[PDB]
Amino acid sequence: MRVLLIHADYFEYEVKDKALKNPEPISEDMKRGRMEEVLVAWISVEKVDEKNPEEVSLKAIEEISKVAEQVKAENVFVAPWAELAKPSVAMDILNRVYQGLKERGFNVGKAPFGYYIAYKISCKGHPLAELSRTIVPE
Amino acid sequence: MRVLLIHADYFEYEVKDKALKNPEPISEDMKRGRMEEVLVAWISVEKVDEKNPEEVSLKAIEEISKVAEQVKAENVFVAPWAELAKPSVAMDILNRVYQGLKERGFNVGKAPFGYYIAYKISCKGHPLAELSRTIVPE
């Protein structure tokens, strides 16, 4: 798994075209969203992660949580970021990350899966505002 | 080398604190910049790239150029993105990419090297608007 973390003043998105033929179905008010003072986590689930989706998900929860704690973000957004795992594996892992971050106490947002998505972001530019992490099954 | 390419409606930046003790010196009007209808290329120069800085630079020029041509971007911005090469190697490669993109005919912008930098970007969200490339010495 590869993760890119951006600590943002704001993040706003709008769903554009399907990237899968059978994407996640969505309601009209899921087509656009916005969060402020937010750690945006772009997650790329890789074929290697199919080896242990649970371990990888728990490592991602922990890594994302740590960074959010260090930068004092109460808000986290999980964004899928298109050697990649099958969509079912990617979807499973993404939902596990999202639910784990919710159990941790964050206000968590997520993007619909299977679409090209336009977005605006403002990265804060402090020393920890743009990080990446690589996570592999042990 | 790892490259992330975002095809953006706009990209605007402002230099914040030094990340190196001895960063690239800059004039007051280099502290902030903005481009529109622009392919933003974040480039991470890795220790492996020290093996052949020329080859890696020419491969990056070519990969970035191809994408810019495919998405019809006339404007390209080269952004450094913090296992990493020594700063002198990273600086050399970044300037070689920048100069090559200029020789190709693009309107090219670049960020000062050695700073944390705040930025705003709006990614277009079409199928080719967010790509990544890995480039290794042969």
Swiss-Prot record, chains A, B:
The keyword Nucleotide-binding applies. GO terms for cellular component: cytoplasm. One of its GO terms (biological process) is threonyl-tRNA aminoacylation. It is found in: Cytoplasm. The keyword Zinc applies. Its main location: cytoplasm. Residues 1-138 are annotated as: Editing domain. One of its GO terms (molecular function) is zinc ion binding. Keywords: Aminoacyl-tRNA synthetase, ATP-binding, Cytoplasm, Ligase, Metal-binding, Nucleotide-binding, Protein biosynthesis, RNA-binding, tRNA-binding, Zinc. Homodimer. The N-terminal domain (about residues 1-143) is an archaea-specific tRNA-editing domain that has a highly similar structure to Dtd (D-aminoacyl-tRNA deacylase); the domain binds L-serine and L-cysteine and most D-amino acids but not L-threonine. Editing of incorrectly charged L-seryl-tRNA(Thr) by this domain is tRNA catalyzed. Catalyzes the attachment of threonine to tRNA(Thr) in a two-step reaction: L-threonine is first activated by ATP to form Thr-AMP and then transferred to the acceptor end of tRNA(Thr). Edits incorrectly charged L-seryl-tRNA(Thr) via its editing domain. Deacylates correctly charged glycyl-tRNA(Gly), but neither glycyl-tRNA(Gly)(2'-dA76) (the terminal 2'-OH of tRNA(Thr) adenine 76 has been replaced by hydrogen) nor the 2'-fluoro tRNA derivative do so, strongly suggesting the editing function is tRNA catalyzed. Belongs to the class-II aminoacyl-tRNA synthetase family. This is Threonine--tRNA ligase.
